[PDB]
Amino acid sequence: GRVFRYFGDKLLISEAKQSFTRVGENNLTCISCFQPRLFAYTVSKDLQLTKYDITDFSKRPKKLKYAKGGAKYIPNTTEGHYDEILTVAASPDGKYVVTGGRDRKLIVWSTESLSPVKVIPTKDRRGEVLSLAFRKNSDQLYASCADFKIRTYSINQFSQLEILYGHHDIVEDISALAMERCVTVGARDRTAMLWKIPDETRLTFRGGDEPQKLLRRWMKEFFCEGSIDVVSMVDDFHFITGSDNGNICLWSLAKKKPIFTERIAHGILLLQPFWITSLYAIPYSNVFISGSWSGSLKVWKISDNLRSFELLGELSGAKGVVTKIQVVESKFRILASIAKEHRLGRWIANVSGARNGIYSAVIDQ
Amino acid sequence: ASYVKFEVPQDLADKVLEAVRKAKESGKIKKGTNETTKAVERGQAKLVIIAEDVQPEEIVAHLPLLCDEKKIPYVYVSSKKALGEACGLQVATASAAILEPGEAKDLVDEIIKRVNEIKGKT
RNA sequence: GAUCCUCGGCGCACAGUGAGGUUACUCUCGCUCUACCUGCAAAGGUGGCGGUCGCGUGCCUCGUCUCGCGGCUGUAUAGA
């Protein structure tokens, strides 16, 4: 279960085909893609869940069906959303799509009819759902929540399996592959945590390095980190994080500190760095994609020795706040949800080219 | 930002937000810039908490000046949404005040003494 | 110097707290027709073109494809 996909150098990024598709909704917060006919699912603060056919890389995402929630659904076990949907994940088997958000509910819908087949409450008055991730090739779902807990589920049992404890702030983002494990990030706790579910153990990785101290040890020959916001797993032994100081860090499970750091990865604009608001490592490959609100999607390549990563290129048609990135293949198709606002309501001054919809990029070789 | 007088490390910023929550529960707080103002003008406030992302900066700019006259310590946090949501509100707040710490006395006393150190003093 | 009281007439902007509450458009690009007629436009119908089944039907290759006919029918890849 390690990195074996080396197509980073092959990618024809400079000649990528770019498109954008407007939606009549406000503020996409997440996008989830299904891969065996390929599908995408989008959720919005406007309480809309939408399904797209994305199998034809020649044409933009084709809208198939939608379901909108609303005030009607105030109780929390009703089969509809009544507060901001923050996250969406498509089940690996093609049968289910599950949503969650500020109304402290998981709602699992059938992909067939886009109808709610099960509603599973978190049962906590602070348990907002912030992020979802299925274990790959499984029905096991992991939901990171705002009450500092990660909840696990068996989706074809429609039940809650257990609860994981460790974080000391909201668990903003969570990533999982094929193993029965997951990575989470705790925002202001400035930790990433690796949960080995069957071993009942957990690794803890710490950021939040004092700049004066960093400078002090750099003189042996920058920007304050206040939150680690995003995370993505590249293989069963490595992962990447993104912070609100622009840092993209590569971590190995064996090391306490990051094995590599690219500081202010999306630049600045006395000095303020662009946050990393999106991060997706395509599983077991040497490429990952990063997003902010700086107007482009940065594609990076990891070294074959896994000790560094480097800038492959930029996808510059991606104006707006990138809230989520997914990658599908047949040819790579990058899909990214673009909003005028940050998923969680963090305040963003002047977003250039603010807009609502889905960015697509098709890359060859 | 320019109305921010000194640098607050995130550990302290989190210990402040904590201090405020316990003070909602067990003591008395004031929430909002006007109410915080009155709390300083009246000398009731023990600690004043100012957000760093106020959007016209000048809205809270008077607080450092006012707190120094009345000799009430003040501290910064990075998010106004985070301070308000600490405060027991579902909306943002630009500044807040702790009037009686209750079950946070120990926690506050450590803050008013860390902000002294990273200010000068001894 | 006025008091103040009444009335009358004529105004009703000031005292504390704190997060509750409340998809559409615009612009570009292109985007199934066509002959005819019934027809003043418009509107209607026929034709085109296609596609459809039954069937016949041309191969020193008689596979498949060619071709047409009867029924009917109108539906392209689809969006940027």
DSSP of A59-102, one letter per residue?
S--EEEEEEE--GGG-----SS--S-EEEEEE-TTSSEEEEEET
Tokens matching residue B53: 């992302």
Question: Per CA to C1' distance, which residue is closest to C19?
Answer: B91
Which amino acid belongs to residue A138? S
- Cβ atoms of A70 and A47 closer than 8 Å: yes
Which amino acid belongs to residue A139? D
Measure Cα distances from A132 to A98, A137, A184, A362, B63 in Å: 8, 15, 11, 25, 42
Please state the φ and ψ torsions of residue A143, each to the nearest 5 degrees. Answer: -120, 115
Cα(A104)–Cα(A121) distance, integer angstroms: 6
Which residues share a beta bridge with A333? A328, A362
Q: Who's near A347: CB < 8 A, 6+ residues apart?
A: B53, B55, B79, B80, B81
For tokens 């450092």, the residue is: B64
Cα(A116)–Cα(A134) distance, integer angstroms: 18
Please state the φ and ψ torsions of residue B102, each to the nearest 5 degrees. Answer: 55, -115
Is residue B117 helix, strand or coil? Answer: helix
The C1' atom of C74 and the CA atom of A61 lie apart, in whole Å, by 29
CA distance B11 to chain A (A): 9
The C1' atom of C21 and the CA atom of A82 lie apart, in whole Å, by 14
Q: Who's near A100: CB < 8 A, 6+ residues apart?
A: A85, A86, A87, A88, A106, A107, A129, A132, A143
CA distance A227 to chain B (A): 9
- Compute CA A212 distance to the chain's CA centroid, rounded to the nearest angstrom: 31
**Contact B18/A at CB under 8 A:** no
Output the CA torsion A78→A79→A85→A91 (10° steps): 140
Q: Which helix (H) or strand (E) holds A304?
A: none
The C1' atom of C67 and the CA atom of A55 lie apart, in whole Å, by 40
**Contact B53/A at CB under 8 A:** yes
Cα(A261)–Cα(A243) distance, integer angstroms: 11
Cα(A82)–Cα(A75) distance, integer angstroms: 9
Cα(A73)–Cα(A80) distance, integer angstroms: 5
DSSP string, B49-90: EEES--SSGGGGTHHHHHHHHHT--EEEES-HHHHHHHTT-S
Chain A to chain B Cβ contacts (< 8 Å):
21
- Cβ atoms of A108 and A160 closer than 8 Å: no
Is residue A255 helix, strand or coil? Answer: coil
Full 3-state SS string of A100-140: EECCCEEEEEECCCCEEEEEEECCCCCCCEEEEEECCCCCE
Q: Which helix (H) or strand (E) holds A359?
A: strand A357-364
Measure Cα distances from B115 to A228, B83, B121 in Å: 25, 18, 10
Cα(A184)–Cα(A191) distance, integer angstroms: 8
Partner-chain residue, chosen from A169, A347, A349, that has the shortest CB–CB distance to B81: A347
Q: Say yes or no for a CB contact (<8 Å) between B10 and A347.
A: no
Q: β-strands B74-77, B47-51: how paired?
A: parallel
Counting Cα atoms < 13 Å in the Cβ hemisphere of A32 gives 26
Helix, strand, coil shares, percent, chain B, to 5? 50, 15, 35
Bases on strand C under 7 Å from any protein CB: 16-20, 22-26, 78-80
Cα(A232)–Cα(A63) distance, integer angstroms: 28
Q: Who's near B114: CB < 8 A, 6+ residues apart?
A: B12
CA distance A193 to chain B (A): 19
Q: Residue A343: which of A23, A107, A45, A41 has the closest Cα?
A: A45
CA max distance for chain A: 63
Measure Cα distances from A48 to A45, A101, A114, A251, B4 in Å: 7, 12, 11, 36, 40
Q: Say yes or no for a CB contact (<8 Å) between A188 and B53.
A: no
- Compute CA A92 distance to the chain's CA centroid, rounded to the nearest angstrom: 16
Q: Say yes or no for a CB contact (<8 Å) between B10 and A208.
A: yes
Measure Cα distances from A88 to A97, A160, A262, A349 in Å: 7, 17, 29, 26
Counting Cα atoms < 13 Å in the Cβ hemisphere of A365 gives 9
CB-based burial, A160-181: b 16+ in 10 Å, e otherwise? beeebebbebbbbbbbbbbbbb
The C-alpha angle A240, A246, A249, rounded to 5 degrees, equals 25
> What resolution (Å)?
7.3
Residues of B in contact with A169 (CB under 8 A): 14
* B92: number of Cβ within 10 Å: 19
* A200: number of Cβ within 10 Å: 9
Q: Residue B78: which of A145, A174, A242, A227 has the closest Cα?
A: A227
Tokens matching residue A116: 């709610």
* A71: number of Cβ within 10 Å: 9
Cα(A297)–Cα(A317) distance, integer angstroms: 8
Tokens matching residue A327: 């990658």
Q: Who's near A353: CB < 8 A, 6+ residues apart?
A: A295, A319, A320
Nucleotide whose C1' lies closest to the alpha carbon of residue A59: C79
The C1' atom of C33 and the CA atom of A24 lie apart, in whole Å, by 33
Tokens matching residue A176: 């999982």
- Compute CA A72 distance to the chain's CA centroid, rounded to the nearest angstrom: 30
Cα(B66)–Cα(B38) distance, integer angstroms: 10
